[PDB]
Amino acid sequence: AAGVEYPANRLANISELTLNEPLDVAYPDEDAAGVLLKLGTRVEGGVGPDGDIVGFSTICPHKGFPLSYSADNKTFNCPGHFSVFDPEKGGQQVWGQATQNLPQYVLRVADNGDIFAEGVDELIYGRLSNVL
Amino acid sequence: AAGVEYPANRLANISELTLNEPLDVAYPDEDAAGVLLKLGTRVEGGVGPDGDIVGFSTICPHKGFPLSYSADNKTFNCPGHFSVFDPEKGGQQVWGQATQNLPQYVLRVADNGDIFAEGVDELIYGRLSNVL
Amino acid sequence: AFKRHIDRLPIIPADAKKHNVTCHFCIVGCGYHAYTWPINKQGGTDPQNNIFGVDLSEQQQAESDAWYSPSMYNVVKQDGRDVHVVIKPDHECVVNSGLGSVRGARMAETSFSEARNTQQQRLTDPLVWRYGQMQPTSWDDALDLVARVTAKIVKEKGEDALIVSAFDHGGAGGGYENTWGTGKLYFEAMKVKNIRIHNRPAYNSEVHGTRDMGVGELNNCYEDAELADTIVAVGTNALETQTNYFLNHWIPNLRGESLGKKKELMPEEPHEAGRIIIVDPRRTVTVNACEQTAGADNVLHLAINSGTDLALFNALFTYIADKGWVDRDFIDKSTLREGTARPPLYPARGVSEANPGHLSSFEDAVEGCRMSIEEAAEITGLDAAQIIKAAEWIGMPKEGGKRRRVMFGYEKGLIWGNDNYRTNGALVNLALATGNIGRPGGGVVRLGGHQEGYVRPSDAHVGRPAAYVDQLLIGGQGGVHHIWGCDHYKTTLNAHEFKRVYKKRTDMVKDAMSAAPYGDREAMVNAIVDAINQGGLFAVNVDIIPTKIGEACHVILPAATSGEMNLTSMNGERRMRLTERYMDPPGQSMPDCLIAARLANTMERVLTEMGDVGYAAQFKGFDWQTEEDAFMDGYNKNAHGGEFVTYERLSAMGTNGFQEPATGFTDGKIEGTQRLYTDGVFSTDDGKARFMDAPWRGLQAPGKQQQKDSHKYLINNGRANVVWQSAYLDQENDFVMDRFPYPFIEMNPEDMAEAGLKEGDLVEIYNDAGATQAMAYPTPTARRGETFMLFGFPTGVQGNVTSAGTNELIIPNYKQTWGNIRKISDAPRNVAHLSFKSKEYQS
Amino acid sequence: NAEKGAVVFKKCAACHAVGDGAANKVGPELNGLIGRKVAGVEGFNYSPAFKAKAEEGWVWDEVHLTEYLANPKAYIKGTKMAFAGLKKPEDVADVIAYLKTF
Numbered sequence A, B: 001a002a003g004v005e006y007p008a009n010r011l012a013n014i015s016e017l018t019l020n021e022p023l024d025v026a027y028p029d030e031d032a033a034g035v036l037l038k039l040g041t042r043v044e045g046g047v048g049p050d051g052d053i054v055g056f057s058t059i060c061p062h063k064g065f066p067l068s069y070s071a072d073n074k075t076f077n078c079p080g081h082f083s084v085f086d087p088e089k090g091g092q093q094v095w096g097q098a099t100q101n102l103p104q105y106v107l108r109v110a111d112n113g114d115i116f117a118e119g120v121d122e123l124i125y126g127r128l129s130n131v132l
Numbered sequence C: 001a002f003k004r005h006i007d008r009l010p011i012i013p014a015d016a017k018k019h020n021v022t023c024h025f026c027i028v029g030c031g032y033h034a035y036t037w038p039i040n041k042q043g044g045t046d047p048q049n050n051i052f053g054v055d056l057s058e059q060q061q062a063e064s065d066a067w068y069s070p071s072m073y074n075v076v077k078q079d080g081r082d083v084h085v086v087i088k089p090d091h092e093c094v095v096n097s098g099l100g101s102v103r104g105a106r107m108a109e110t111s112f113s114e115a116r117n118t119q120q121q122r123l124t125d126p127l128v129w130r131y132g133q134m135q136p137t138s139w140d141d142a143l144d145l146v147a148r149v150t151a152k153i154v155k156e157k158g159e160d161a162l163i164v165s166a167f168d169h170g171g172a173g174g175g176y177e178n179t180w181g182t183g184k185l186y187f188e189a190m191k192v193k194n195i196r197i198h199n200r201p202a203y204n205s206e207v208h209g210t211r212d213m214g215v216g217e218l219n220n221c222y223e224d225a226e227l228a229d230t231i232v233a234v235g236t237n238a239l240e241t242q243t244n245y246f247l248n249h250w251i252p253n254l255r256g257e258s259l260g261k262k263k264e265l266m267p268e269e270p271h272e273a274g275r276i277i278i279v280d281p282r283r284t285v286t287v288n289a290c291e292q293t294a295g296a297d298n299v300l301h302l303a304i305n306s307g308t309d310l311a312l313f314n315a316l317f318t319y320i321a322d323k324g325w326v327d328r329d330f331i332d333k334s335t336l337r338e339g340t341a342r343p344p345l346y347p348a349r350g351v352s353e354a355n356p357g358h359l360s361s362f363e364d365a366v367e368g369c370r371m372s373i374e375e376a377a378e379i380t381g382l383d384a385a386q387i388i389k390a391a392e393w394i395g396m397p398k399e400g401g402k403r404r405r406v407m408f409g410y411e412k413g414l415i416w417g418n419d420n421y422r423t424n425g426a427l428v429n430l431a432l433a434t435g436n437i438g439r440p441g442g443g444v445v446r447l448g449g450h451q452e453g454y455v456r457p458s459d460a461h462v463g464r465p466a467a468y469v470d471q472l473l474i475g476g477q478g479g480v481h482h483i484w485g486c487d488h489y490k491t492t493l494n495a496h497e498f499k500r501v502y503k504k505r506t507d508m509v510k511d512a513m514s515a516a517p518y519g520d521r522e523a524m525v526n527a528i529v530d531a532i533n534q535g536g537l538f539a540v541n542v543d544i545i546p547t548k549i550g551e552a553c554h555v556i557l558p559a560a561t562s563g564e565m566n567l568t569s570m571n572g573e574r575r576m577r578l579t580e581r582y583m584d585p586p587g588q589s590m591p592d593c594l595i596a597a598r599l600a601n602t603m604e605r606v607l608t609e610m611g612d613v614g615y616a617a618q619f620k621g622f623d624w625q626t627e628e629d630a631f632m633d634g635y636n637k638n639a640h641g642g643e644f645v646t647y648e649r650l651s652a653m654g655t656n657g658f659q660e661p662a663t664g665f666t667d668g669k670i671e672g673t674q675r676l677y678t679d680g681v682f683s684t685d686d687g688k689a690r691f692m693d694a695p696w697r698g699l700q701a702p703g704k705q706q707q708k709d710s711h712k713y714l715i716n717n718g719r720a721n722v723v724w725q726s727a728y729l730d731q732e733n734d735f736v737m738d739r740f741p742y743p744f745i746e747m748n749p750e751d752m753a754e755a756g757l758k759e760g761d762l763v764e765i766y767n768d769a770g771a772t773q774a775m776a777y778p779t780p781t782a783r784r785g786e787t788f789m790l791f792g793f794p795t796g797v798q799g800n801v802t803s804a805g806t807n808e809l810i811i812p813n814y815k816q817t818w819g820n821i822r823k824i825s826d827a828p829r830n831v832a833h834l835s836f837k838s839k840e841y842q843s
Numbered sequence D: 001n002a003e004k005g006a007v008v009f010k011k012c013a014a015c016h017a018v019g020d021g022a023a024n025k026v027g028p029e030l031n032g033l034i035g036r037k038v039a040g041v042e043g044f045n046y047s048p049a050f051k052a053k054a055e056e057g058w059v060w061d062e063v064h065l066t067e068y069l070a071n072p073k074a075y076i077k078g079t080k081m082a083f084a085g086l087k088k089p090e091d092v093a094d095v096i097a098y099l100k101t102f
């Protein structure tokens, strides 16, 4: 198989999400931590009827410290070496030591409203293949 | 799983090779026709004591026409659309419709002089994976 | 040898998105499909999981549809996402039958990819010369500067002060949308006189000769190459230069594969396998391929002296006429019967620079053209028996007294060859005399260069002859130069002198702009115009890469090419296809037609602000938001049969599209024209073809005989099969640059040994016009004294040693070039890895 | 069996045509074959080693033909059909069962 085979995993329903509060989640398996986040404005990789639901790896691509979320700035913040990632701009490193922007999830909302993740746009921290 | 996993296959012995006479071979399976060939000169990819033994896929990388050897010029010649390949210079297309130089074998000569193929440097005609 | 080490490609899934793609490159216009799918999806090896419905876990055999090479695969942006893309030859296209050339098969890997790092040279942003170097800026800023300098200079000195160089061709860097957009700006909104085309330094036809005679140069179909008794190929290297027309249509004829179709379509006459005459001073891989598929018996390579085609053709015409090997009924019904008086200056000169040849009846032309077999033999250096046999292969009837069917094909050996107007005429005489126009197995055609995609307002204002634009520029005339999709630095004639002066004049404007405040735009504009007034030139380049002439330009605007946009063009068969957009423009690049519309909108605003609302109103009609708007304003409203053609209808007809001109629309099918002049009514006021009284007068371009006489070698020039044009994409393609890092100059091994030269050596070619460099490539098949240098090549420009010499209609006589050769240095170490063996396939 | 001779003929079809219309290509048309002479077909340019092996007098009987599709090269040294030649002798037998039609 030339490409990584990504499972199509249910993570949540649109109705489970509050504006600007991350929901803890994991993809493509239970040992790769991440969040779903409703930002309240239309954005890159943003699904749902407002185009504002995004999903990201929450493990820092530098050395794997878990990232905190700043509700005020809508940024992910690494207490490891002070890296900052912008979930409103496809996870662009605003500032930091990672050589990657924050790995982001290919999300699909179903007719029923369930949210499936079907891929990741960068290598997740601590695995040499996104699917192990 | 990230790269193609290449079998280490026995093709021939150094003793089986007559100067300038292609020995018909298959690598990395039965359906991947190629040749071994002693050239009586030191060249790119060459193995054995003189460094003159080369291995090539012998199916035109343009449209799969079986190639034919000219002993006088030491060239593979395609009767399909008149492509010419130089196995003295790493199977460079001297002229031709292929977007590839001739796929060439990674050869190893063991102590007994048995010749082995451990990989190919270009995509073999008619397979989207060099190992099927 | 360059190896990609790609062991494995992604499988195209069953549900991949399919796009109809015509080849970006040569006239043949081979059909392809672009299959795109999400970056995180892939196809399976089982039939139900890939696009082919085939089990891919099993080796595929020769000519498989269920395979693609690495060069056919990339990752590209589509609607702002990365997708897999495979660009594959269409097996069901009648043109190529799933053949792809060395060029078209690398459309995918010569695409722009951030993810796979392909063609990072591609322009993403407008660049302006300020602060002492090129600097990226906004469209609004760049267009405002271009318009303010353009509007001021034409307001102050007239439109004659605006110089334009632009593509007039089809496919990528051309096409109906882009010729219309540039044509409307410079010929509708304005009346630009001082405009040249991408391959010639005035606004002229390559082939006024055939056109004045009433024979449009693309009058047949590709089937006729399959159906001819004889093919006459003149100054074409079709295997390298029109590859899949040769392979998919000529080869079947020469091999007899065609015999069944011949007998079905023309019973009531005899048919043997096709024979071929090749008029070319050089033995090509085309001569070899023909010998090898039809045997030496059936191939007549007429190795004429350089630029003597007209002598050969006049002798064939004379011999054929004298034998009555002519279609008497065709001549009497479909050609001009009225006698007309020779011009006073005949035969040395035409009635004017405008009309270098005399149009007449069959009989007047024969007596005018009249040349003995003995004399043509003297001039051509052919043997009498070669010319007589060529006459028999064209003229002599088949068994039941039936007409021999002859397709006459020519390209740049004739067109860039001696006495363009007369040679073109002399060849049409032969096809006219033998009734080989508008019949199956016939035609007198260009074999072509680019695809065709021309639709523009009238060019009546330009004149005939038109302005020799390069001489205006070298002579210090013009203020502003707009350059669209051409690179004179690599491809014009007299290129050394062109560069000397172009650099000095653009340098004067550069120094002024480096010394002036940019953030105050009006002062920047005034410093530019003051520098122009001292003899400077402000240059704007519209391209997809940083060009060589772009190193002299003050503004670069980034264009989107075919595939990043919808594009319509037709092949050397008039086969019109829609290339359907499959990917995004790189960065902020925009289609040429939409750049023209945007510049038009900016011209309107700037002219309104300067207080000239009347001139400003001429720049209306440019509200296009997509390339389709340009198609509908241009082709749809102005092309012959345009009202029948839309994107939607063209899409439905796929890579086979339809032959122009379109006659109607019936249940999801545009109806087209397989052949021109089937009713024997030609493109003239009264409907009669004219013959051409086209006498031989030597080498007609100024200084050519002198250049032959005063230099040791012929520097013949033209294409390599591997290289596309000026290597604008190829120069960032390891496969091509691995093969020829330097342009080859084909030299006779005995000539190299006499000059102390070995394979790979770097040599200076020099003469009266300038100097350049190439790598010596030993070529046994090359005649002594006669070299061939790859043209348009960034790492050694052949144009530097071509003189300013043109015919009366300003056609560049590139092919008749002579110079001396001396060593620069021993083979550079980067050529050590090169093969120096014959390009000629051996059985 | 001739059904799985059609599958083995995929390795010939590039150079060889068979059935209604079949014309000469890189190789000569292969219609009939069983009962045709060597260097047989009109139009095709056979090698000075395939002409030399018609001079002595031959036919395409099924035993002469088995030797060719297995090692074309040294079996008729100087033949223009350079190509490995089918190594499984039961496939040599399948493709000749296909050739039995036409």
Ligand SMILES: Nc1nc2c(c(=O)[nH]1)N[C@H]1C(S)=C(S)[C@@H](COP(=O)(O)OP(=O)(O)OC[C@H]3O[C@@H](n4cnc5c(=O)[nH]c(N)nc54)[C@H](O)[C@@H]3O)O[C@H]1N2
Residues within 6 Å of the ligand: C172, C173, C174, C198, C199, C412, C416, C449, C484, C485, C486, C487, C488, C490, C491, C492, C493, C542, C543, C544, C545, C547, C559, C560, C561, C562, C592, C717, C718, C724, C725, C726, C727, C728, C729, C791, C792, C798, C799, C802, C814, C815
């Ligand atoms: N000595 C000699 N000189 C010759 C010839 C010869 O035989 N001998 N041949 C002549 C002939 S036939 C020709 S065609 C000319 C070619 O002369 P040029 O037209 O100068 O050569 P190309 O390489 O085709 O140039 C195409 C340019 O357009 C750019 N381009 C490509 N696509 C696009 C697009 O979509 N938009 C824009 N805006 N730009 C684009 C490319 O990057 C490149 O700079 O050379 C001529 N010069």
Ligand SMILES: Nc1nc2c(c(=O)[nH]1)N[C@H]1C(S)=C(S)[C@@H](COP(=O)(O)OP(=O)(O)OC[C@H]3O[C@@H](n4cnc5c(=O)[nH]c(N)nc54)[C@H](O)[C@@H]3O)O[C@H]1N2
Residues within 6 Å of the ligand: C026, C027, C103, C234, C235, C236, C237, C238, C240, C241, C242, C279, C280, C281, C282, C284, C305, C306, C307, C308, C309, C411, C412, C413, C414, C417, C418, C448, C449, C450, C716, C717, C718, C719, C720, C721, C722, C723, C724, C725, C726, C815, C816
């Ligand atoms: N691979 C490849 N194919 C291309 C192109 C490319 O860049 N690369 N470009 C395309 C374009 S824009 C064009 S215009 C065409 C050009 O297509 P061609 O015109 O076929 O190609 P050239 O190599 O320019 O010249 C053709 C032949 O003219 C011969 N010749 C030189 N002098 C004379 C003469 O006095 N008389 C005669 N009869 N022949 C002479 C040369 O030896 C050469 O073999 O190719 C098109 N296709």
Ligand code: HEM
Residues within 6 Å of the ligand: B065, B066, B079, D008, D009, D011, D012, D013, D014, D015, D016, D026, D027, D028, D030, D037, D038, D039, D040, D041, D045, D046, D047, D049, D050, D069, D078, D079, D080, D081, D082, D083, D086, D095
């Ligand atoms: C299973 C596959 C093939 C079969 C069964 C086959 C069969 C044959 C046969 C029976 C002949 C001799 C018939 C005669 O003399 O008229 C022949 C000759 C020939 N074949 Fe094939 N062939 C095969 C594949 C190929 C391929 C792949 C090529 C070329 C790449 C090819 C090229 C030729 C040529 C050139 C000759 C003429 C030999 C000469 O002139 O010396 N064949 N083939």
Ligand code: F3S
Residues within 6 Å of the ligand: C023, C024, C025, C026, C027, C028, C029, C030, C096, C099, C100, C101, C103, C104, C105, C242, C243, C244, C245
């Ligand atoms: S693939 Fe492209 S380059 Fe010409 S021969 Fe066919 S159009």
Ligand code: FES
Residues within 6 Å of the ligand: A060, A061, A062, A063, A064, A065, A078, A079, A080, A081, A082, A083, A096, A097, A098
């Ligand atoms: S681990 Fe996050 S900044 Fe280093």
Ligand code: FES
Residues within 6 Å of the ligand: B060, B061, B062, B063, B064, B065, B078, B079, B080, B081, B082, B083, B096, B097, B098
């Ligand atoms: S298959 Fe070899 S050149 Fe086309």
Ligand SMILES: [Mo+4]
Residues within 6 Å of the ligand: C199, C449, C450
């Ligand atoms: Mo051209």
Ligand SMILES: [O]
Residues within 6 Å of the ligand: C199, C448, C449, C450
């Ligand atoms: O051209």
